[model samples]
Target chain A: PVVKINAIEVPAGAGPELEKRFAHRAHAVENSPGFLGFQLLRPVKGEERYFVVTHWESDEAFQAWANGPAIAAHAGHRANPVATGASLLEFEVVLDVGGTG
Target chain B: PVVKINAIEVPAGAGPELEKRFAHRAHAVENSPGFLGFQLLRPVKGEERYFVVTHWESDEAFQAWANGPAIAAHAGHRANPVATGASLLEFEVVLDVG
Candidate 1:
């Protein structure tokens, strides 16, 4: 599967709000086609940044969701700016292991 | 859980060899304490780099393994220079979503 790493740099002390909003809307992308797995991680001690890492079946499946309504609703209407800078990076999973699967 | 993203900038066309070594040695860290998950990713169309993304139960758990022998063997003794520059970045997983 391919992967998408949406790097978000949130301000200090703003992580909880972003995570709460994210967790509440898990269903938004979980139901989308090609969705494989999702995880929300918080820094114990480092940059006040967050990573939205998702696994997709392929490039076609990912691009379709990227331009679809689900992504718009999920990313467009944020109550507040969760991050000051956000960048999206794509990758191909060459080796994925050590999970429940 | 804390996350570790080890960014490796490999030479052009050296990705496959690096991946083969990584895949063959999964057992080394699979059973380590606090090791939640691991993923070796290659750039599909951008810079010729790889990311070793791993999840740990806590900082202490991660540190233990980082200083342990397994990490040395896993990272050291490469067949060839798979990467020219390797940097490790640590982060907390907050707001992980689609």
Candidate 2:
């Protein structure tokens, strides 16, 4: 199964910092067993907006990171601040399979 | 406002064709006024799967293309066959302001 996470908001002056942290986590995740590469989408114009999307090998592997190390490490900090201070939303792939692009 | 189109299913054995078509569409969209770059993600191993994620200048810009020539031009082709034959799912941002 393909897993998707979206609408990640960084603080007012947190764009650069978010980028730095993301690069670190993203690099580590890419090296994980079921890890796939990730894409970071930033709004050209918006309210300190960004998105972190990663495709995992399977739902199991993704859950491993989500409920384990990945979330446990940073989700707490992000959960409280960005959750209230900034705009954020998360999404998942209910049904997926597609042609290569 | 950000608009996302996901789980686009294309024809099997049509990977290269889809990529070529996407390259063309993507280039045109990028050159558009509110167009931002797009990311096409492929699975390391799967049943022929991939994802296309694009960040636009705004939801208005994204909608302009979707309802304008972009979708009007290619959406039909992708609809009929891929609809039933391939696995596909589409989602929208509801709360949106966030």
Candidate 3:
């Protein structure tokens, strides 16, 4: 498996809306092939960067979703940009243990 | 909940042993209270950094394990060192929708 961490910097106080969008609605990526898990985390006491973490079965699976229309359609629905800057960090999963929660 | 990512740089070719250590044996942290999940990841290609990712219910829960005798005892059994550099990164889970 693989993991991609998209480090996104948003304006202060925008965390709630961004987080609400995630919880208030369902995402297409959830049903995407090879999708394992996801978590959107806010860095440092609920400010600064929001790490958009996604788990996939392989690199091909991730690329498929990245190039697909799902993300494009999602972006087109945006009114204003919440992200100021972003970068992708990739990793290979060596061991993954499911959450007891 | 909270997440802690430990970025560790290991010596070349040490990944296998590190990974084996995690898979071959049952971790005490698995039974630790408030433990949620864990993933040990290798950065970039198949080398460089190894991220020790852990999820906990709260900051206090994490601290209880980090400062307890378990980690100290785990460290005591170490042979030499596989890690060259390391840093702890923390995050508050804004929306952990899965």
Number of the top-ranking candidate, with TM-score as the measure: 3
Q: Quote each prediction's TM-score.
A: 0.83, 0.43, 0.84
Runs of candidate 3 exceeding 4 Å displacement: A45-48, A74-76, A98-101, B45-48
For residues B1-98, could you state the per-residue lDDT of candidate 2 as single tens digits? 35354545555676566565555555555465565565555433432455565555567877687778676666435432332233222222222210
Candidate 3 residue lDDT tens string, B1-98: 99988878888788888777768643556767888878888887533578888899998888898898556866547566667888777888876545
Best model number under lDDT:
3
State the displacement of the C-alpha of residue A70, model 1, in Å, after optimal TM-score superposition.
3.2
- What local distance difference test score does each model get? 0.75, 0.51, 0.77
What is candidate 3's lDDT per residue for A26-93, written digit by digit as tens?
36567789888788887864235788888899998988988885577775475666778887888998
Q: Write the per-residue lDDT of candidate 1 for residues A1-101, one digit (tens) a residue.
A: 99887768878888778888777876667767888867665655443457777789998888898888655675546577668997677899887788333
Off by over 4 Å in 1: A44-48, A71-78, A99-101, B45-48, B71-78, B94-98
lDDT for each residue of candidate 1 in B1-98, tens digit (9 for 90 to 100): 77888888888778778888888876567777888888888887543568888888777888898888556765546365657887777876554544
Clashes of 3: 0
Cα deviation in Å at residue A95, candidate 3? 0.8
